[PDB]
Short mmCIF file of all heavy atoms in Angstrom, two decimals:
data_model
loop_
_atom_site.label_atom_id
_atom_site.label_comp_id
_atom_site.label_asym_id
_atom_site.label_seq_id
_atom_site.Cartn_x
_atom_site.Cartn_y
_atom_site.Cartn_z
N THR J 27 -20.22 15.62 -22.94
CA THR J 27 -20.80 14.48 -22.24
C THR J 27 -19.73 13.68 -21.50
O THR J 27 -20.02 12.97 -20.52
CB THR J 27 -21.52 13.55 -23.20
OG1 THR J 27 -20.64 13.24 -24.30
CG2 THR J 27 -22.86 14.22 -23.68
N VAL J 28 -18.48 13.80 -22.00
CA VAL J 28 -17.32 13.12 -21.37
C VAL J 28 -16.62 14.06 -20.38
O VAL J 28 -16.36 13.71 -19.23
CB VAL J 28 -16.19 12.80 -22.43
CG1 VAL J 28 -14.96 12.19 -21.74
CG2 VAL J 28 -16.76 11.88 -23.57
N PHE J 29 -16.28 15.25 -20.83
CA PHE J 29 -15.54 16.13 -19.94
C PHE J 29 -16.34 16.83 -18.84
O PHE J 29 -15.77 17.20 -17.78
CB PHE J 29 -14.71 17.09 -20.79
CG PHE J 29 -13.58 16.41 -21.57
CD1 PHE J 29 -13.72 16.10 -22.93
CD2 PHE J 29 -12.36 16.10 -20.93
CE1 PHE J 29 -12.67 15.48 -23.67
CE2 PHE J 29 -11.28 15.47 -21.67
CZ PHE J 29 -11.44 15.17 -23.02
N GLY J 30 -17.65 16.97 -19.07
CA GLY J 30 -18.54 17.59 -18.07
C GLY J 30 -18.46 16.75 -16.80
O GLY J 30 -18.12 17.26 -15.72
N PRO J 31 -18.73 15.44 -16.90
CA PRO J 31 -18.64 14.60 -15.69
C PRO J 31 -17.21 14.39 -15.23
O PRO J 31 -16.92 14.30 -14.03
CB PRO J 31 -19.36 13.31 -16.07
CG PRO J 31 -19.40 13.33 -17.58
CD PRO J 31 -19.49 14.78 -17.97
N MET J 32 -16.27 14.36 -16.17
CA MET J 32 -14.89 14.18 -15.73
C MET J 32 -14.47 15.30 -14.77
O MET J 32 -13.85 15.06 -13.73
CB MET J 32 -13.93 14.17 -16.92
CG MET J 32 -12.57 13.68 -16.50
SD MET J 32 -11.44 13.89 -17.88
CE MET J 32 -9.81 13.50 -17.03
N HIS J 33 -14.79 16.53 -15.16
CA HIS J 33 -14.45 17.70 -14.36
C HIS J 33 -15.30 17.70 -13.05
O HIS J 33 -14.75 17.79 -11.92
CB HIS J 33 -14.75 18.98 -15.18
CG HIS J 33 -14.25 20.23 -14.54
ND1 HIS J 33 -14.93 20.87 -13.52
CD2 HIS J 33 -13.17 21.01 -14.82
CE1 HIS J 33 -14.31 22.00 -13.21
NE2 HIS J 33 -13.24 22.11 -13.98
N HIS J 34 -16.60 17.54 -13.19
CA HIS J 34 -17.48 17.53 -11.99
C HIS J 34 -17.07 16.52 -10.91
O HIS J 34 -16.89 16.86 -9.74
CB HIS J 34 -18.92 17.20 -12.38
CG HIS J 34 -19.83 17.12 -11.19
ND1 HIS J 34 -20.23 18.22 -10.47
CD2 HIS J 34 -20.42 16.05 -10.58
CE1 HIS J 34 -21.03 17.86 -9.48
NE2 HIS J 34 -21.16 16.55 -9.53
N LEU J 35 -16.96 15.26 -11.30
CA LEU J 35 -16.62 14.19 -10.35
C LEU J 35 -15.23 14.33 -9.75
O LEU J 35 -15.02 13.96 -8.59
CB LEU J 35 -16.80 12.85 -11.04
CG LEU J 35 -18.26 12.53 -11.34
CD1 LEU J 35 -18.40 11.31 -12.14
CD2 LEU J 35 -19.01 12.39 -10.00
N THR J 36 -14.28 14.89 -10.49
CA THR J 36 -12.94 15.05 -9.94
C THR J 36 -13.02 16.03 -8.77
O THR J 36 -12.34 15.85 -7.73
CB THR J 36 -11.97 15.68 -10.98
OG1 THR J 36 -11.63 14.71 -12.00
CG2 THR J 36 -10.70 16.20 -10.26
N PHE J 37 -13.83 17.09 -8.91
CA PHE J 37 -13.89 18.09 -7.82
C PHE J 37 -14.94 17.86 -6.78
O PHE J 37 -14.90 18.49 -5.73
CB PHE J 37 -14.01 19.50 -8.41
CG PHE J 37 -12.84 19.85 -9.25
CD1 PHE J 37 -12.92 19.80 -10.63
CD2 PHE J 37 -11.57 20.04 -8.64
CE1 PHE J 37 -11.76 19.94 -11.44
CE2 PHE J 37 -10.42 20.17 -9.45
CZ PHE J 37 -10.53 20.11 -10.86
N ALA J 38 -15.86 16.92 -7.06
CA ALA J 38 -16.90 16.58 -6.10
C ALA J 38 -16.29 15.64 -5.08
O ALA J 38 -16.81 15.50 -3.97
CB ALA J 38 -18.05 15.88 -6.78
N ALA J 39 -15.20 14.97 -5.46
CA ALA J 39 -14.60 14.05 -4.51
C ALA J 39 -13.90 14.90 -3.46
O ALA J 39 -13.26 15.89 -3.80
CB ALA J 39 -13.57 13.13 -5.22
N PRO J 40 -14.00 14.52 -2.18
CA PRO J 40 -13.30 15.36 -1.22
C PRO J 40 -11.80 15.19 -1.41
O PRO J 40 -11.35 14.22 -2.02
CB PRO J 40 -13.76 14.81 0.13
CG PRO J 40 -13.99 13.33 -0.17
CD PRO J 40 -14.70 13.40 -1.53
N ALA J 41 -11.04 16.14 -0.90
CA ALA J 41 -9.59 16.11 -0.98
C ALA J 41 -9.07 14.93 -0.15
O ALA J 41 -9.70 14.49 0.81
CB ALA J 41 -9.03 17.40 -0.43
N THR J 42 -7.92 14.38 -0.51
CA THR J 42 -7.38 13.34 0.35
C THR J 42 -6.03 13.86 0.81
O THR J 42 -5.26 14.39 -0.01
CB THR J 42 -7.17 12.01 -0.37
OG1 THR J 42 -6.45 11.14 0.51
CG2 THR J 42 -6.29 12.22 -1.65
N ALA J 43 -5.72 13.70 2.10
CA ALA J 43 -4.44 14.15 2.63
C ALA J 43 -3.30 13.41 1.99
O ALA J 43 -2.14 13.82 2.14
CB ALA J 43 -4.37 13.95 4.18
N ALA J 44 -3.58 12.31 1.28
CA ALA J 44 -2.47 11.61 0.64
C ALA J 44 -1.76 12.52 -0.38
O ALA J 44 -0.53 12.43 -0.58
CB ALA J 44 -2.99 10.35 -0.10
N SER J 45 -2.54 13.36 -1.05
CA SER J 45 -2.00 14.31 -2.06
C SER J 45 -1.24 15.42 -1.34
O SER J 45 -0.17 15.87 -1.77
CB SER J 45 -3.13 14.99 -2.84
OG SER J 45 -3.93 14.07 -3.52
N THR J 46 -1.79 15.89 -0.23
CA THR J 46 -1.12 16.94 0.52
C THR J 46 0.22 16.47 1.03
O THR J 46 1.24 17.18 0.95
CB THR J 46 -2.03 17.42 1.71
OG1 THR J 46 -3.09 18.18 1.15
CG2 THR J 46 -1.27 18.32 2.65
N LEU J 47 0.21 15.27 1.59
CA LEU J 47 1.41 14.66 2.11
C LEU J 47 2.49 14.52 1.03
O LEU J 47 3.71 14.65 1.27
CB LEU J 47 0.99 13.29 2.65
CG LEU J 47 1.66 12.56 3.80
CD1 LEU J 47 2.01 13.50 4.96
CD2 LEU J 47 0.67 11.47 4.21
N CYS J 48 2.05 14.28 -0.20
CA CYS J 48 2.98 14.13 -1.31
C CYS J 48 3.77 15.46 -1.52
O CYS J 48 5.00 15.48 -1.60
CB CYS J 48 2.22 13.75 -2.60
SG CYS J 48 3.36 13.47 -4.01
N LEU J 49 3.06 16.57 -1.62
CA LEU J 49 3.80 17.82 -1.80
C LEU J 49 4.61 18.19 -0.53
O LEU J 49 5.76 18.66 -0.61
CB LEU J 49 2.82 18.97 -2.13
CG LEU J 49 2.00 18.86 -3.43
CD1 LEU J 49 1.46 20.21 -3.73
CD2 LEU J 49 2.81 18.43 -4.63
N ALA J 50 3.99 18.02 0.63
CA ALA J 50 4.69 18.39 1.88
C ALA J 50 5.98 17.56 2.05
O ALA J 50 7.01 18.07 2.49
CB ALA J 50 3.72 18.19 3.10
N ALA J 51 5.94 16.28 1.67
CA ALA J 51 7.11 15.42 1.76
C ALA J 51 8.19 15.85 0.78
O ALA J 51 9.37 15.83 1.11
CB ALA J 51 6.73 13.95 1.44
N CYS J 52 7.78 16.25 -0.42
CA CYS J 52 8.74 16.68 -1.44
C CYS J 52 9.51 17.92 -0.91
O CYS J 52 10.74 18.00 -0.98
CB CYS J 52 7.96 17.00 -2.71
SG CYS J 52 9.07 17.46 -4.07
N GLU J 53 8.78 18.88 -0.37
CA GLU J 53 9.42 20.09 0.17
C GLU J 53 10.29 19.78 1.41
O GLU J 53 11.40 20.30 1.55
CB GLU J 53 8.40 21.20 0.51
CG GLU J 53 7.61 21.66 -0.68
CD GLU J 53 6.77 22.89 -0.39
OE1 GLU J 53 6.12 22.92 0.68
OE2 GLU J 53 6.73 23.80 -1.27
N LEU J 54 9.80 18.90 2.27
CA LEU J 54 10.55 18.52 3.46
C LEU J 54 11.95 18.07 3.11
O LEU J 54 12.92 18.39 3.83
CB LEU J 54 9.82 17.40 4.17
CG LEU J 54 10.18 16.96 5.61
CD1 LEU J 54 9.44 15.64 5.91
CD2 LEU J 54 11.64 16.76 5.76
N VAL J 55 12.08 17.28 2.03
CA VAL J 55 13.41 16.80 1.66
C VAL J 55 14.19 17.75 0.78
O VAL J 55 15.32 17.46 0.41
CB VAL J 55 13.35 15.38 0.99
CG1 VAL J 55 12.51 14.39 1.92
CG2 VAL J 55 12.63 15.51 -0.44
N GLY J 56 13.61 18.91 0.47
CA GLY J 56 14.37 19.87 -0.30
C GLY J 56 13.93 20.06 -1.76
O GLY J 56 14.47 20.93 -2.47
N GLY J 57 12.97 19.25 -2.23
CA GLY J 57 12.55 19.41 -3.63
C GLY J 57 11.64 20.61 -3.81
O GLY J 57 11.09 21.14 -2.83
N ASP J 58 11.46 21.04 -5.05
CA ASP J 58 10.54 22.15 -5.32
C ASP J 58 9.13 21.56 -5.41
O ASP J 58 8.97 20.47 -5.94
CB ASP J 58 10.85 22.81 -6.68
CG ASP J 58 9.82 23.90 -7.03
OD1 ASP J 58 9.72 24.88 -6.30
OD2 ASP J 58 9.07 23.74 -8.01
N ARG J 59 8.14 22.28 -4.90
CA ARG J 59 6.76 21.80 -4.91
C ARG J 59 6.30 21.23 -6.27
O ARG J 59 5.61 20.22 -6.32
CB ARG J 59 5.82 22.93 -4.50
CG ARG J 59 4.38 22.57 -4.49
CD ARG J 59 3.57 23.70 -3.84
NE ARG J 59 4.04 23.91 -2.47
CZ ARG J 59 3.35 24.51 -1.49
NH1 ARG J 59 2.13 24.99 -1.72
NH2 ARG J 59 3.90 24.60 -0.28
N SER J 60 6.67 21.91 -7.36
CA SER J 60 6.28 21.45 -8.70
C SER J 60 6.78 20.07 -9.10
O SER J 60 6.18 19.42 -9.97
CB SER J 60 6.69 22.49 -9.76
OG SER J 60 5.69 23.53 -9.73
N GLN J 61 7.86 19.60 -8.50
CA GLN J 61 8.39 18.27 -8.87
C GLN J 61 7.43 17.16 -8.44
O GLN J 61 7.47 16.04 -8.97
CB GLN J 61 9.73 18.00 -8.19
CG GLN J 61 10.82 18.94 -8.69
CD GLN J 61 12.15 18.64 -8.09
OE1 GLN J 61 12.48 19.14 -7.01
NE2 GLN J 61 12.94 17.84 -8.78
N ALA J 62 6.55 17.49 -7.52
CA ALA J 62 5.64 16.45 -7.04
C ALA J 62 4.23 16.71 -7.40
O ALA J 62 3.38 15.96 -6.97
CB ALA J 62 5.72 16.39 -5.50
N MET J 63 3.94 17.78 -8.16
CA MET J 63 2.54 18.12 -8.40
C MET J 63 1.78 17.08 -9.21
O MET J 63 0.63 16.71 -8.88
CB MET J 63 2.47 19.51 -9.05
CG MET J 63 1.10 19.98 -9.38
SD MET J 63 0.02 20.01 -7.88
CE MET J 63 0.65 21.47 -7.16
N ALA J 64 2.43 16.55 -10.24
CA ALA J 64 1.72 15.54 -11.08
C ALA J 64 1.38 14.32 -10.27
O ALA J 64 0.27 13.76 -10.38
CB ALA J 64 2.58 15.14 -12.33
N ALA J 65 2.28 13.93 -9.37
CA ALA J 65 2.02 12.77 -8.54
C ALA J 65 0.88 13.06 -7.57
O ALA J 65 -0.02 12.21 -7.35
CB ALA J 65 3.29 12.37 -7.81
N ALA J 66 0.90 14.24 -6.95
CA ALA J 66 -0.20 14.57 -6.02
C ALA J 66 -1.54 14.63 -6.73
O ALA J 66 -2.57 14.19 -6.15
CB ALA J 66 0.10 15.92 -5.32
N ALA J 67 -1.56 15.17 -7.95
CA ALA J 67 -2.80 15.22 -8.75
C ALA J 67 -3.23 13.80 -9.10
O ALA J 67 -4.42 13.42 -8.96
CB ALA J 67 -2.58 16.02 -10.04
N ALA J 68 -2.26 12.96 -9.51
CA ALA J 68 -2.62 11.56 -9.85
C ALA J 68 -3.18 10.86 -8.61
O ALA J 68 -4.14 10.06 -8.69
CB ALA J 68 -1.37 10.76 -10.41
N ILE J 69 -2.61 11.14 -7.45
CA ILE J 69 -3.12 10.49 -6.25
C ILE J 69 -4.56 10.94 -5.99
O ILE J 69 -5.40 10.13 -5.65
CB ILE J 69 -2.20 10.76 -5.05
CG1 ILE J 69 -0.87 9.98 -5.28
CG2 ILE J 69 -2.95 10.44 -3.73
CD1 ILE J 69 0.29 10.27 -4.27
N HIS J 70 -4.83 12.23 -6.17
CA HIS J 70 -6.21 12.69 -5.97
C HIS J 70 -7.17 11.99 -6.99
O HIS J 70 -8.28 11.53 -6.64
CB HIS J 70 -6.30 14.19 -6.18
CG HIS J 70 -7.72 14.66 -6.19
ND1 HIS J 70 -8.46 14.73 -5.04
CD2 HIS J 70 -8.56 14.95 -7.21
CE1 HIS J 70 -9.71 15.04 -5.35
NE2 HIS J 70 -9.80 15.19 -6.66
N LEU J 71 -6.74 11.91 -8.24
CA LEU J 71 -7.57 11.24 -9.27
C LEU J 71 -7.84 9.75 -8.94
O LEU J 71 -8.99 9.28 -9.07
CB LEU J 71 -6.91 11.42 -10.66
CG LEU J 71 -6.84 12.88 -11.16
CD1 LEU J 71 -5.73 12.99 -12.24
CD2 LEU J 71 -8.21 13.37 -11.64
N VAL J 72 -6.82 9.00 -8.51
CA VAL J 72 -7.08 7.60 -8.16
C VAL J 72 -8.13 7.59 -7.00
O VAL J 72 -9.11 6.81 -7.01
CB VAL J 72 -5.76 6.90 -7.70
CG1 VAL J 72 -6.04 5.55 -7.05
CG2 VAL J 72 -4.88 6.70 -8.93
N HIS J 73 -7.92 8.46 -6.01
CA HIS J 73 -8.84 8.53 -4.86
C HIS J 73 -10.22 8.92 -5.34
O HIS J 73 -11.23 8.34 -4.94
CB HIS J 73 -8.31 9.57 -3.83
CG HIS J 73 -9.37 10.22 -3.00
ND1 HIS J 73 -10.09 9.53 -2.05
CD2 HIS J 73 -9.86 11.49 -3.00
CE1 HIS J 73 -10.97 10.35 -1.48
NE2 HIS J 73 -10.85 11.54 -2.04
N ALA J 74 -10.29 9.91 -6.22
CA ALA J 74 -11.61 10.37 -6.70
C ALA J 74 -12.34 9.24 -7.44
O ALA J 74 -13.56 9.01 -7.25
CB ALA J 74 -11.46 11.60 -7.62
N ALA J 75 -11.63 8.53 -8.31
CA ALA J 75 -12.31 7.42 -9.03
C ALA J 75 -12.85 6.36 -8.04
O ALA J 75 -14.02 5.88 -8.18
CB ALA J 75 -11.34 6.74 -10.03
N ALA J 76 -12.04 6.00 -7.03
CA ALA J 76 -12.47 4.95 -6.05
C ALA J 76 -13.73 5.45 -5.27
O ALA J 76 -14.65 4.70 -4.97
CB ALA J 76 -11.31 4.67 -5.07
N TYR J 77 -13.73 6.74 -4.94
CA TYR J 77 -14.84 7.40 -4.22
C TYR J 77 -16.10 7.36 -5.12
O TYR J 77 -17.19 7.00 -4.66
CB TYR J 77 -14.43 8.86 -3.94
CG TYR J 77 -15.56 9.70 -3.32
CD1 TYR J 77 -15.75 9.75 -1.94
CD2 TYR J 77 -16.41 10.45 -4.12
CE1 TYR J 77 -16.79 10.54 -1.40
CE2 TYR J 77 -17.43 11.22 -3.59
CZ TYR J 77 -17.61 11.25 -2.24
OH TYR J 77 -18.69 11.97 -1.73
N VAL J 78 -15.97 7.72 -6.40
CA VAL J 78 -17.15 7.60 -7.29
C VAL J 78 -17.63 6.15 -7.36
O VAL J 78 -18.84 5.85 -7.12
CB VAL J 78 -16.82 8.12 -8.73
CG1 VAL J 78 -17.99 7.88 -9.70
CG2 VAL J 78 -16.58 9.61 -8.63
N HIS J 79 -16.72 5.22 -7.63
CA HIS J 79 -17.13 3.82 -7.73
C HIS J 79 -17.72 3.23 -6.45
O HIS J 79 -18.69 2.47 -6.51
CB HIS J 79 -15.97 2.95 -8.21
CG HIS J 79 -15.72 3.07 -9.68
ND1 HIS J 79 -14.76 2.33 -10.35
CD2 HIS J 79 -16.32 3.83 -10.61
CE1 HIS J 79 -14.79 2.63 -11.63
NE2 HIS J 79 -15.73 3.54 -11.82
N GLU J 80 -17.20 3.61 -5.30
CA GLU J 80 -17.71 3.03 -4.06
C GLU J 80 -19.12 3.51 -3.68
O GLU J 80 -19.77 2.86 -2.84
CB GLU J 80 -16.76 3.31 -2.93
CG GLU J 80 -16.74 4.67 -2.38
CD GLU J 80 -16.23 4.61 -0.93
OE1 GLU J 80 -16.88 3.93 -0.10
OE2 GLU J 80 -15.18 5.17 -0.62
N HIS J 81 -19.58 4.61 -4.28
CA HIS J 81 -20.95 5.12 -4.03
C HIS J 81 -21.94 4.87 -5.18
O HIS J 81 -23.06 5.38 -5.15
CB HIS J 81 -20.94 6.63 -3.79
CG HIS J 81 -20.23 7.03 -2.52
ND1 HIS J 81 -18.90 7.42 -2.50
CD2 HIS J 81 -20.63 6.99 -1.24
CE1 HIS J 81 -18.51 7.59 -1.25
NE2 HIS J 81 -19.55 7.33 -0.46
N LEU J 82 -21.53 4.12 -6.21
CA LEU J 82 -22.42 3.80 -7.33
C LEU J 82 -23.66 3.10 -6.82
O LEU J 82 -23.57 2.26 -5.96
CB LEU J 82 -21.74 2.81 -8.32
CG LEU J 82 -20.66 3.31 -9.25
CD1 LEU J 82 -19.97 2.08 -9.90
CD2 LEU J 82 -21.27 4.26 -10.29
#
Side-chain angles (χ1 to χ4, degrees):
Chain J
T27 50
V28 176
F29 293 100
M32 193 187 171
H33 189 280
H34 177 72
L35 292 173
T36 287
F37 299 102
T42 171
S45 300
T46 287
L47 209 43
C48 183
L49 298 196
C52 183
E53 299 189 315
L54 193 191
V55 309
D58 175 63
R59 179 171 300 201
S60 280
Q61 294 183 273
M63 179 57 77
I69 290 172
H70 171 73
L71 295 159
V72 168
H73 152 69
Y77 174 88
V78 175
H79 283 183
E80 75 155 300
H81 294 95
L82 285 168

